[PDB]
Amino acid sequence: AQLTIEAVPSNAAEGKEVLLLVHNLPQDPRGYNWYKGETVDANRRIIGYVISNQQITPGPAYSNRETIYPNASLLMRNVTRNDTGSYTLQVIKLNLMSEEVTGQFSVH
Ligand SMILES: [Cl-]
Ligand SMILES: [Cl-]
C-alpha cells in the first residue's frame, strides 16, 4: 500500500548505472517530480513528468545522465561520488494533493 523507492543497486561504483524504482503508485496520478535531497524544493528539482500530455519537465538540477520513466522510476547513468545522497519523489494525485517518499544510494 505504501509508496516506496528501491535503489538498484544501493551501492554503485563510479561510472555505473543506478535505478530508483518506484513501487505502489496510486492509480490515476497526474504526475511526478524528483528532487535532490529530502523534501520538495523547487531549486533542487531534477525532472518530472506530466501524464496528461506526457511532458517531461527537466528542472534546475537536471543532468542529461537521467531519464524518467512513465511509472515514475528514475534511471541515472554514469554515476559519480557526488550523486551519493537522498532523492525525493513527489507524486501528484488525482485530487492535486502531493505525497512524497525519500530514498537514497551511495557511489564509491
Ligand atoms: Cl543530499
Ligand atoms: Cl532507498
From Swiss-Prot:
What does changing R45Q do? Answer: Inhibits heterophilic cell adhesion
On tissue specificity, the annotation reads: Expressed in leukocytes of chronic myeloid Leukemia patients and bone marrow.
* Lineage top rank: taxon: Eukaryota
Query: One GO BP annotation here?
Result: immune response
Key word Glycoprotein present: yes
Q: Which UniProt keywords apply?
A: Cell adhesion, Cell membrane, Disulfide bond, Glycoprotein, GPI-anchor, Immunoglobulin domain, Lipoprotein, Membrane, Repeat, Signal
Tell me what PTMs the record reports for this protein. Glycosylated.
Q: What does this protein do?
A: Cell surface glycoprotein that plays a role in cell adhesion in a calcium-independent manner. Mediates heterophilic cell adhesion with other carcinoembryonic antigen-related cell adhesion molecules, such as CEACAM6. Heterophilic interaction with CEACAM8 occurs in activated neutrophils.
Subunit composition and interactions:
Monomer. Heterodimer with CEACAM6; heterodimerizes via its Ig-like V-type domain.
The protein's name: Cell adhesion molecule CEACAM8
Organism annotation? Homo sapiens
Gene that produces this protein: CEACAM8
